[PDB]
Amino acid sequence: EIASNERVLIDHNKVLRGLKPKDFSSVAKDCELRILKEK
Amino acid sequence: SALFDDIFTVQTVDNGRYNKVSRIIGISTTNSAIKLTLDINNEMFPVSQDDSLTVTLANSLSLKSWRPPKPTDKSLADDYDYVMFGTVYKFEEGDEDKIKVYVSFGGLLMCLEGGYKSLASLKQDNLYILIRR
């Protein structure tokens, strides 16, 4: 009953967003192009 | 690449006579006595009292006739919400550590008050101001 009634405001992955989220999609794309695809 | 970065809190927003232009006054969170006065366009970048802004100054956007930017190319401006280009018309070497820089973004005026240590590199002809919120 506690587990059913309990709700957490922020998610486990989303906890770093909080009240102000920011996107690092360009950073992830650059990391993929320059580390995984690094020659 | 960049010449100055900081984070400011808006103390006052003065709309005055204009409907589209507001004058904001801000002070750096990290280093006090660094003031910022700036005219911005309300319609494209509205700001409220006590907001937090990330102000960056740069002499270039890279990483003479203007042209609309191609979608393929990328620049420093892609990370920010508001970018302006102006000319420095006064670099005031005042007191021991009181430096004033006056910039004019096509008639929209900015005054950055601070110490010589931070603003030493701002002795340029033109400057970009990149603002993020």
Next chain:
Amino acid sequence: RQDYIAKVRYQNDLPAPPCPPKLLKYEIEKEAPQKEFLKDS
């Protein structure tokens, strides 16, 4: 190389779990009270 002694160590240590207080679901967050409320005459 006898020069200034200084150590460089980047800090990327994960913080401890915060364990924030848990929200309480409303009566309208459960299916049976929703069924009772929507089927009202």
Next chain:
Amino acid sequence: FLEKYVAVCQEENYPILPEAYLVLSRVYENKDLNVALDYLMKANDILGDKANVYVLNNLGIYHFFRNNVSQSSDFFAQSLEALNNVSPQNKEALSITLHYNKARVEEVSNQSEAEKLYSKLMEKCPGYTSNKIRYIYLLALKSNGNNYADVQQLLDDFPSDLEVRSFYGWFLKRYGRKNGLKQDLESQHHKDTLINYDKHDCYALLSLGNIYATIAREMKVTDQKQNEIKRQQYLRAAQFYHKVLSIDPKNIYAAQGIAIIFSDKERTGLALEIFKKVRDTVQDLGTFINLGHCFMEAKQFGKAIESYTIALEKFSNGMDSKLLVLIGRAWYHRGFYEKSMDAYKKALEVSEQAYQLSKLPALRFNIVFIQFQIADFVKSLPNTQRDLTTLENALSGLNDAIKSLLKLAELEQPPYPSEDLKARATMGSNTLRNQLERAIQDQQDYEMSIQEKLRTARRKQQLDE
């Protein structure tokens, strides 16, 4: 639709159902906490005396996230008062939840009442996990991590709980060398957690990436094969961070690890951009330290000085010696590359304050090296760019540095070999001291010539008058 319903009800002057406000607050929980709190306050005002325990608890949690400690405490007190009207079936569960929230508020305020309520809830309900996690965490803080048996027992109680495993891994990362446990034990624990429980947990992936980065950094490089193995470990860590970013692209710590790898790979620009973005996102001591390190690698010594000063004032409050060491190093680098004497003076003053705070041989050697560099720079300077006072201070610093070098050479384990200390002291004493005395004599002659000219000019002026 709910906004349209509210507008239509307001135009019709009909009582707005508070359930719509509760639904709006629930939806805005993931979008805007301010709008959700405002709608919840409007619902509470509409209800009046019909306020329930859930509404008051959510208001208290909203004010807790808003850092409104007083208002959150008042709302929690009202929730505890209204708890007496709860039906007996859910009364125990809601009492446990409210006591847990009150214990959280105490843990923010005063740990003693938090531990008391934690013990009360543990006796009331041993099955709850967050209570045990927080209580063991406070015990670890109070005992400086001497409760490894309690952490292991908690791990055994809930092997499937992600929070328990993450706390256990955090305790391992904090006190592995203190407890003498295996270095790879945390690595195998996180690997087992990812393989058998959840492969999308960003915490375990980041922990494995940090462990692999530490292994790669501590690995000795001798040839191309060792560099390739180190690059493979960094590639594994980067794959962990990229998996974290695939789960959630808003992860600051994954980007921080990527920037650290780039710094290890000498990709200074990307690391600088990532660290600036992280600083724009969150402001802690580690971000400022990494920014200062990157500015030192990017040769922007003034920005490094500013970043270290802001870090020290904001967090360390002038107590940490390591930040003072970084400030002294940055000032010394700026003075060396820009030929500025005031930078040397500031570095010497910071090193002296740090030594007075610590009294370590390493900072003694730092002071000696700074004073030797000061003497060399002043000697290299022309007479017109210096004065007698700077020469006297440099000479006194040279004498103190030679004496401190002799003192360091008599120590058990100096940071540098005693033969090198003695050789450098002898080399300085043979030549640099005499060059300083010659510079003093030349400066005295130059000042005397100036004074002779000044005194001779006035007499001729008076004769002409």
Next chain:
Amino acid sequence: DLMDEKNSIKPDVIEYAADILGDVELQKELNSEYEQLVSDRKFLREIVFVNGDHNW
């Protein structure tokens, strides 16, 4: 004044700031300039414009 050090030309505006103090011929030139300026001030203030108007 080339004698008093705090009432002279600043040292960061001239590259010859060192070998400037103590000169007497140069001080005579500067005194001649200042006397000419004082004569001009007297002339303008006493003969030409007596009410102090100076925008002409």
